[PDB]
Amino acid sequence: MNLQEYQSKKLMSDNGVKVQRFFVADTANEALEAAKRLNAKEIVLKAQILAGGRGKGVFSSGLKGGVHLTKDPEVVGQLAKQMIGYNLATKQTPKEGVKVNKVMVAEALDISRETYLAILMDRSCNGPVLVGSPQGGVDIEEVAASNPELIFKEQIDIIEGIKDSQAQRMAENLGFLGPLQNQAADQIKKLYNLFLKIDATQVEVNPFGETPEGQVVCFDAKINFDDNAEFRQKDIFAMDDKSENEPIENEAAKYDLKYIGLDGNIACFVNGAGLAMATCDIIFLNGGKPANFLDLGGGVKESQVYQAFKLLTADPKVEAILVNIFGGIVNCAIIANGITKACRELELKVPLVVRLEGTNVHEAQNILTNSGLPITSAVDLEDAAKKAVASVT
Amino acid sequence: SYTASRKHLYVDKNTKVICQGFTGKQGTFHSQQALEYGTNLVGGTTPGKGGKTHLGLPVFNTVKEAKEQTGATASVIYVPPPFAAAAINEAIDAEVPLVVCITEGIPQQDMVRVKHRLLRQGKTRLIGPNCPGVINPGECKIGIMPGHIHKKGRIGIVSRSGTLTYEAVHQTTQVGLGQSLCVGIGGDPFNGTDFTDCLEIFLNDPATEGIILIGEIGGNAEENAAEFLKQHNSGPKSKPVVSFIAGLTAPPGRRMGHAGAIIAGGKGGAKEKITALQSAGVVVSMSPAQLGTTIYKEFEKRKMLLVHH
Ligand SMILES: CCNC(=O)CCNC(=O)[C@H](O)C(C)(C)COP(=O)(O)OP(=O)(O)OC[C@H]1O[C@@H](n2cnc3c(N)ncnc32)[C@H](O)[C@@H]1OP(=O)(O)O
Ligand SMILES: [Mg+2]
Numbered sequence: 001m002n003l004q005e006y007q008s009k010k011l012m013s014d015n016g017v018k019v020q021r022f023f024v025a026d027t028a029n030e031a032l033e034a035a036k037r038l039n040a041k042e043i044v045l046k047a048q049i050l051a052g053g054r055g056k057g058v059f060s061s062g063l064k065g066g067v068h069l070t071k072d073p074e075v076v077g078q079l080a081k082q083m084i085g086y087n088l089a090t091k092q093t094p095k096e097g098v099k100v101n102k103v104m105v106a107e108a109l110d111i112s113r114e115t116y117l118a119i120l121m122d123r124s125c126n127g128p129v130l131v132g133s134p135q136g137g138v139d140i141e142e143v144a145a146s147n148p149e150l151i152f153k154e155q156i157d158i159i160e161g162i163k164d165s166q167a168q169r170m171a172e173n174l175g176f177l178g179p180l181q182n183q184a185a186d187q188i189k190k191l192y193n194l195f196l197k198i199d200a201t202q203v204e205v206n207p208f209g210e211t212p213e214g215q216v217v218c219f220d221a222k223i224n225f226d227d228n229a230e231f232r233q234k235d236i237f238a239m240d241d242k243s244e245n246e247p248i249e250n251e252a253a254k255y256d257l258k259y260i261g262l263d264g265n266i267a268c269f270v271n272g273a274g275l276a277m278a279t280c281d282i283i284f285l286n287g288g289k290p291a292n293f294l295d296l297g298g299g300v301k302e303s304q305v306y307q308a309f310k311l312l313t314a315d316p317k318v319e320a321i322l323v324n325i326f327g328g329i330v331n332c333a334i335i336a337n338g339i340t341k342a343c344r345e346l347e348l349k350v351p352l353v354v355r356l357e358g359t360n361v362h363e364a365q366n367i368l369t370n371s372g373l374p375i376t377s378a379v380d381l382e383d384a385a386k387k388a389v390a391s392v393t
Numbered sequence: 394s395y396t397a398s399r400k401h402l403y404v405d406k407n408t409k410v411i412c413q414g415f416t417g418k419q420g421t422f423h424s425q426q427a428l429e430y431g432t433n434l435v436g437g438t439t440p441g442k443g444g445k446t447h448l449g450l451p452v453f454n455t456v457k458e459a460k461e462q463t464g465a466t467a468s469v470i471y472v473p474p475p476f477a478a479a480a481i482n483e484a485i486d487a488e489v490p491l492v493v494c495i496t497e498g499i500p501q502q503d504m505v506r507v508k509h510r511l512l513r514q515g516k517t518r519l520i521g522p523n524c525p526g527v528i529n530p531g532e533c534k535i536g537i538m539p540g541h542i543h544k545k546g547r548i549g550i551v552s553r554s555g556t557l558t559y560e561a562v563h564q565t566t567q568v569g570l571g572q573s574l575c576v577g578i579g580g581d582p583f584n585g586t587d588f589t590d591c592l593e594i595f596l597n598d599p600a601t602e603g604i605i606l607i608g609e610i611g612g613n614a615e616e617n618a619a620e621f622l623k624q625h626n627s628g629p630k631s632k633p634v635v636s637f638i639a640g641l642t643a644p645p646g647r648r649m650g651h652a653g654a655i656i657a658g659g660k661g662g663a664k665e666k667i668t669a670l671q672s673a674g675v676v677v678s679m680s681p682a683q684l685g686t687t688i689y690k691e692f693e694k695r696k697m698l699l700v701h702h
């Protein structure tokens with residue numbers, strides 16, 4: 001899921017993490033009042049979209065730039081009038097841009113030190129890990145490549161919790177000094193407790209830094225969430241902003257379907273994550289471009305099969321569909337039922353290649369046969385991939 | 394050490410199994426299939442339903458009572474995500490030797506906490522979660538894999554993917570090699586058994602003459618397995634290892650179905666895994682369809698398919 005900047009910063013602020021003071025506005029007048037309420041020396045007005053490149057974007061009003069600084073609250077209101085209700089286009093959006101319904105009105109803070117700090121569960125050590133670098137303001141991948149010696153880690157014991165000495169050592173290695181080091185250590189603890197409270201897979205602060213006036217601040221941050229914890233994070237997941245997702249991914253989400261759009265024309269319909277990845281892989285190896293990844297899940301039900309198939313057939317990028325099922329917990333007949341019923345209710349305009357193995361394969365194959373649908377049966381994975389690639393221009 | 398429990402992975406005809414979540418939809422169905430396969434399924438647990446029978450077998454309120462009353466040495470978990478970590482912990486506390494967790498969807502943080510307890514004991518071995526289970530063909534099946542595609546034989550299989558396990562099984566049965574023991578370690582990032590745990594068992598099992606290792610993007614388990622094989626599978630007795638790593642075409646920063654299958658912060662790509670395994674002497678199949686033929690050819694070159702006349 002995805003949160004707007006104002007949503008993640010509120011979540012952090014509500015948990016003791018220091019961020020810039022801000023308000024969110026959905027009208028130009030609200031932006032004006034928020035700017036007055038801030039009582040700040042300088043104010044930043046920021047359109048709320050998820051895509052990057054806001055600073056050099058252009059609104060459908062004609063206004064250039066999605067991020068503006070001013071000392072004058074009335075200018076905040078005036079510029080907000082040229083943002084709200086309009087589409088913001090950037091290098092990272094489609095040509096049409098994204099509709100801006102909200103702006104953030106925040107205190108503009110100068111940055112005197114920039115560092116990197118992330119918290120995640122370590123994939124090599126059991127338990128949380130703090131990952132930090134004094135080299136802030138760049139992708140962590142760049143630092144790892146150019147200056148691996150500037151990446152520091154503190155392994156945390158999940159039962160003991162974060163210790164003062166761990167937070168202090170990381171703050172020191174990030175380069176904070178004296179009272180700012182004590183501030184940063186305290187903020188690391190707040191970030192750690194937040195990370196556990198919200199079932200994040202990662203809290204990434206970059207830049208984690210300080211102002212010239214002597215305060216440690218999380219200037220910007222990205223939080224990723226564990227989808228497996230949605231059942232105990234309902235309020236956070238209700239904030240999910242889906243307006244910038246592929247619309248097919250949004251439809252798939254409504255039916256709890258794990259769909260990921262790709263740049264290709266051969267749709268994939270598979271009952272396991274490993275086999276789904278391998279199906280994309282083997283399509284590529286035989287000269288094709290998969291249109292999507294889809295893992296129906298071991299607990300897939302017929303209704304989800306039906307919905308998944310309709311999403312594929314309705315996608316204009318799809319020129320053929322490869323169904324590849326090796327059922328264990330998944331009964332192949334559920335696949336055959338969902339597909340045949342989905343096609344009873346529309347014409348099959350693309351070639352359909354089907355590979356079924358495992359649980360109840362013979363009944364499933366008879367269902368496909370007795371439906372009369374035009375199917376190319378495949379004998380194994382390689383044959384399925386070759387026949388799928390052969391079915392497209 | 395927790396490594397002392399690795400031996401419990403090797404289920405056999407004398408393993409006795411209880412089902413946690415026994416009265417649920419999947420617990421019921423797969424318990425019925427287990428009985429029909431010949432697995433010694435002796436009962437199960439659902440809290441609050443102790444003192445009932447189900448499939449002609451006793452239902453218990455607790456793992457401790459079930460274990461004491463049946464002599465069970467293994468448990469399989471079909472408990473929904475909100476409670477499955479508690480079910481694992483109950484089985485650890487009861488010192489069940491082998492616990493197999495089928496459930497997909499357990500919060501990652503729950504499993505970090507489970508692993509903390511697991512690593513500080515040596516009585517219980519956990520496979521999973523989010524895994525199809527373990528099978529010794531013709532001897533013991535604990536999980537959801539389709540029974541009919543297996544054949545007792547010569548290849549040990551360990552995989553982060555259930556479906557890809559079935560591919561490797563079907564391929565190795567088709568070419569006549571069969572399987573000694575198949576272990577699905579599951580697709581979650583934090584789990585009870587890794588590749589190295591199974592490789593230890595395979596390398597020391599006389600019945601396992603070759604190994605298929607199936608991985609995917611995410612984490613570092615494949616790299617750890619490569620390091621293990623560098624130290625422990627060199628020499629004249631080295632066993633052939635064949636592998637496929639899924640996800641060379643996966644995009645970065647996205648969980649590909651499995652909670653553990655993501656290239657995150659530049660870490661977890663398939664290319665580096667293939668390189669690490671190749672450096673450890675593993676023969677990596679270009680195609681997921683050719684696992685069986687690839688290991689067959691490795692056997693052939695080593696004169697391991699000669700007929701005794
Ligand atoms: C191969 C990868 N794995 C997969 O693809 C599996 C995907 N599916 C899942 O993970 C599913 O959540 C599961 C198969 C685990 C469960 O689904 P299922 O449809 O069987 O759930 P149900 O709700 O019918 O059954 C769960 C049972 O566990 C019981 N249960 C709950 N907590 C516990 C516990 N701590 N110990 C034992 N049983 C428990 C529930 O009471 C319920 O039984 P009941 O309905 O008789 O009261
Ligand atoms: Mg799966």
Ligand SMILES: [Mg+2]
Pocket residue numbers: 139140658
């Ligand atoms: Mg990044």
